[PDB]
Each structure stands twice: as C-alpha cells, then as structure tokens.
Task: structure prediction
Amino acid sequence: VELPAGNYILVGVDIDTTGRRLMDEIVQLAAYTPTDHFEQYIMPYMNLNPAARQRHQVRVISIGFYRMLKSMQTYKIIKSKSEIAALKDFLNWLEQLKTKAGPSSDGIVLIYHEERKFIPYMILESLKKYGLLERFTASVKSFANSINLAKASIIKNYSLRKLSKILSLFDGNASVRAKLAFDVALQLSNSDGKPEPKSSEALENMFNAIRPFAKLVVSDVLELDIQIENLERQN
Amino acid sequence: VELPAGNYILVGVDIDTTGRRLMDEIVQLAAYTPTDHFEQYIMPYMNLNPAARQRHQVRVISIGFYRMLKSMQTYKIIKSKSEIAALKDFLNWLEQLKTKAGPSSDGIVLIYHEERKFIPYMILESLKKYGLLERFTASVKSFANSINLAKASIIKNYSLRKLSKILSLFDGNASVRAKLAFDVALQLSNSDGKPEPKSSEALENMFNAIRPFAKLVVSDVLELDIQIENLERQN
Result:
C-alpha cells in the first residue's frame, strides 16, 4: 500500500491503440465520471494493425496525400486531433475536475481494468514524450487497476461487458470501457448491483476497495522506464 | 530596425515540407554554421503532395500498416524521428552552440533565404505546438531573411544555387539550402567570392548587412498568429 488516505476523485480511463506494445500509438483517449466524461480520437503516424482494426472497428484511410480515421461501423469519417492537442485537452479536463472538487481535494485516481498492465504505461509514455508529466502529476496521483476487485468476487477470466451483465454498447470503444471500469468497480466495492454513484459512502467504499492496488505515478514511471530499457536492448 | 547590436551567432536554416501552406508539416529541419551543422528528417502524419515530392525527392511509402520516408534518388529508406524529438534535438544543438560561444554571446540569429516568408512561420508554429517557444527564445533572438542582400546586389528572381554559381549538390535538400543561404550572405555582405568564414570581420560584415532585415522572434510570432487567425476564418 503506497497511496495514502485522502479525498480523491475517482475517474475511469481507457485507450484505443494501433497495437498492444509500448511502441504503438494511442488512437483514442477516454475518461469517465458519473457527471463528466472525456473522449478524443487521435491521429496516428502508422496505421492500426489487423487485430487493432477489428478490435476498435476504426481504420485509417487515404484520400490522395491526406490520411484520416474512419469508422468501420458507420463508414463515416472520424474527426481527430494530434496527440499533443488531445493531451492538452485531457490535462485541462483533469484540472477543471480537481478545481470543481474544491480546495479539500487530494487529486485524481485514474481507474483502469485489464489483465495485462498497458493503459498506464502508454499514457505516461505519451505525457513523458511532450514533457507533460509534471503538469499531469499535479492533478492525477495514481493509476489503479480495478481487475483485482473482480478477481476477489469470482471463475478466472471475465471481460468488462461480461462482469457488467452479471452484476446487473460497443466495448471496442475506449469511452464505453471507461464507463464500464468505473461502474463495475462501484458495483463490486459496494456489493450492490445498482449503487448510487452520487452517494458519498458508495464512492468512499469504491476508493477504499481499490486503494490497496493504487500505484503512485512515480512507481509506474519507474516500471515504464524499465520496460523501455528492455525493448531498446531486446530490439 | 528592431534587433539591437551585439555579439550574435549566425546560423543558416531551412526546412523541407509536405506543402507550402502553414497547415502542412515539416519533413526535414536543417541548420548550418561553417564549423557545425544540424539536420533531421521528421515523419509526417500526411504524405507529401505531388509538388513537394518532386521538390525534395522524398516520399512516404507503406509497408503493411507502417509508414516511413524513402528517397526517390537513392531508393533507400530514410530514418526519421517525431517532430517533437527532432525539435528537442534542435534546441539542444542551439544551446551547445550558444554555450561554446561563451558568456559574451547575445544569442543566435537564424538566417533563411526565400521570396515568400514561410520558414520562420513553420518553425515557430511547431515550437508553439509543443510549448517550446520560451526555451527557443533563450537561444535564438531573431529570424532574418537574407534575400534582401541579393536584391541589392542585382535582375529580379535568382535562386540560391543560381546566386552561389554567379558569386563563385541537390538543392531540394534543406541541409544544402541552409549552407547556401549562409555562404551567399557571407559572400554578398563582404563583396567577396571567397570570404573567410572564420574571419571576425567577415562575420561582422555579414551580421551588419542582415541586421536591418532581422525580426525579433516576438514580431514574427505576432505575424504568425495573424496569418493563423485568417486561415481559420477563411476556411
């Protein structure tokens, strides 16, 4: 246990990418709270690999010398921004969130849900890329994988949509998974299928349930730096 | 005249791009001094347009879901970096340059050569994109178009390679043009076909010849902000 007790804002988060390795790129960044959500598509330098195209149902098309994202469900063009502009929007969103919580807020805990740690590494890598890590840490204090709650309430492997249906939308979309990660964690932490997301005790139960798994940003950065040191040598 | 007198480092600069509009992207950034040069290819999000491909003899190819630059002269792959990483290398290069000049240096004057002002706007836009403008201004104090020297020594339109041959390599390459812009300005400012680039007086003649056309970085940023305000409305 390394995240000290306090008054935190709980925020679900997830990402869509061109692949499942640290060298790949974020294509959508999404975050969620019951009263506020954020999502932004990001234009990659490369194209999504076959598995990523199928997973997210998004691909890159070319029109002459221009490239742009396209939905494989609606067949409509997807408006996107650069990675830096999307991150600056994300940081502003995190900051107005901590602001709205008042001077008693100790920061934000980003909650993600996955078997193989990936989401926090990719986000921290993109922040580190542009020198935004210091600004980020002013708002966010920890990433916390909520999958451990699911492991304690089970049954080996169960997806998010699988857990949500049991405890009670296209899950290839990061914005859908950011909501699911939050709600599933709120349900499991309260032993309730329909908890009140605006209830002080419900959110307090949620925080205390995930706190043992919450890592400080500094801790994940060190894990990130190590994983990057290996790929550079193992290349 | 807005650049005050002082002890400056003169540096030729030029860029290769996907097009000739502020919405396009830098594909190579290059700078030059007689004893030190910098050049880095940059991976664009879009492809180069037909005119840009012909001009620089570089294009983007796809290998599966990967994209990469390729030389249309050598047919070999061109290693490239992201725009942010290239800029950070560029800033470090500018800084070790001002460092090597000692504590008496007043900064760097970037010298470019073109009829239609473009080079400074593109570089400043990319710096502003990543929040590097403040760091940039610590080393560089002005962009200065040396084409006015050529206009005074002529004859309407003469290219760089044209002037160099008269006063005395593929000019689609930004690194070749960065050298030419410097040498032509050194030749014209000294009324000499073979001036000594390590001569204190030769460099002093060069600086004083271009000083009347040297704009402060702040002045070009304001011009940049205006040009961007027009395109957003004229879109």
